[PDB]
Design an enzyme around this catalytic site. Structure first.
Site, short mmCIF file in Angstrom:
data_model
loop_
_atom_site.label_atom_id
_atom_site.label_comp_id
_atom_site.label_asym_id
_atom_site.label_seq_id
_atom_site.Cartn_x
_atom_site.Cartn_y
_atom_site.Cartn_z
N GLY A 92 2.16 6.67 9.00
CA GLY A 92 3.82 6.71 8.50
C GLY A 92 4.60 5.80 9.22
O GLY A 92 5.58 5.39 8.70
N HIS A 114 0.72 -1.09 0.04
CA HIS A 114 -0.02 0.06 0.03
C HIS A 114 0.99 1.09 -0.12
O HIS A 114 0.31 2.21 -0.57
CB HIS A 114 -0.93 -0.15 1.30
CG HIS A 114 -0.39 0.58 2.49
ND1 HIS A 114 -0.33 -0.40 3.48
CD2 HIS A 114 -0.23 1.81 2.79
CE1 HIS A 114 0.05 0.32 4.61
NE2 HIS A 114 0.34 1.66 4.10
N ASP A 163 -0.75 -7.44 1.78
CA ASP A 163 -0.22 -6.12 1.96
C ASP A 163 1.40 -6.34 2.18
O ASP A 163 1.77 -6.02 3.31
CB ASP A 163 -0.94 -5.10 2.83
CG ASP A 163 -0.50 -3.58 2.85
OD1 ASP A 163 0.27 -3.50 1.73
OD2 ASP A 163 -0.80 -3.05 3.76
N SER A 202 3.40 2.45 8.68
CA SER A 202 3.22 1.28 7.88
C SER A 202 4.35 1.07 7.23
O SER A 202 5.27 1.43 6.82
CB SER A 202 2.27 2.02 6.55
OG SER A 202 0.77 1.79 7.26
#
Lengths: 245, 13
Positions: free
Chosen positions: A196, A46, A97, A198
């Site tokens: 942030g 993502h 993801d 992630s």
């Protein structure tokens, strides 16, 4: 990271800071990642799906601060950006993801291990820690809702793994969370990953060894009551990781 | 559009 502590890269030496160069030349922070081998950083799809041009990304290893240089830091370009073909995104949930970045310095070199640059072990197949296990998360994400800039100093916190049964309760995430995901949170909802963070690591002790158990993926709000952080369950993706590296 | 973890580096952030 909401709550937790300021840290330094020597305490998180597998942590990769990923930035993007914009048309015009400004550079912004994108996401975290984890060094799993000298040439490979693992992160979340993502973080890249809207701007999947590998030339735009800069990866730092050995870096403790967002906009200042750290002694011993190494800068890399992305030789190969591999996103998961079955990635998708719902209102909250992100699926498959996971992303791999093959990194290369301008000289063509991969990471050189040091005090501040080390790989993190991958877990074995189907092998996760038990629920209630305390694990660490690290990143440059928001520290509170009102932040409009990311913090300059790297942060870490410790959260507990939450069972799939608990996470799929109707006031948690219901059926939006799947068995390819791991939930983790603070029992008092005081600390969590946030925007942030992630792509960064969820690291647990598994048989005495620091292991990359999860990748920060999604969650409603940050440190919001009954809304755990949701992490890509790395142990389910080993075949994909093995085949793509 | 969308906010939070999952939305970094998106046009709809």
């Amino acid at each position: 990271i909401i709550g937790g502590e300021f840290t330094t890269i020597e305490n998180q030496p597998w942590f990769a800071a990923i930035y993007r160069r914009h048309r015009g030349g400004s550079v912004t922070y994108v996401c975290g990642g984890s060094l799993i081998s000298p040439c490979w950083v693992i992160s979340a799809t993502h973080c890249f799906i809207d701007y999947p041009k590998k030339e735009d990304y800069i990866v730092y290893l050995g870096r403790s601060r967002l906009n200042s240089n750290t002694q011993g830091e190494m800068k890399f370009e992305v030789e190969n950006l591999i996103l998961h073909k079955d990635y998708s995104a719902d209102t909250l949930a992100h699926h498959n993801d996971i992303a791999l970045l093959k990194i290369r310095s301008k000289e063509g070199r991969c990471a050189q291990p040091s005090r501040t640059i080390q790989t993190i072990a991958l877990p074995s197949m189907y092998n996760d820690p038990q629920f209630g296990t305390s694990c660490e998360i690290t990143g440059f994400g928001k520290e509170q809702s009102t932040d409009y800039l990311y913090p300059e100093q790297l942060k870490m916190t410790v959260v507990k793994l939450i069972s799939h049964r608990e996470c799929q309760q109707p006031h948690y995430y219901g059926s939006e969370v799947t068995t390819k995901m791991l939930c983790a949170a603070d029992p008092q909802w005081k600390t969590d990953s946030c925007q942030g963070d992630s792509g960064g690591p969820l690291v647990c002790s598994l048989q005495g060894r620091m292991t990359l158990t999860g990748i920060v993926s999604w969650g409603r709000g940050c440190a919001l009551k009954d809304k755990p952080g949701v992490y890509t369950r790395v142990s389910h993706f080993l075949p994909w990781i093995r085949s793509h590296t | 559009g969308x906010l939070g973890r999952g939305c970094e580096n998106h046009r709809c952030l």
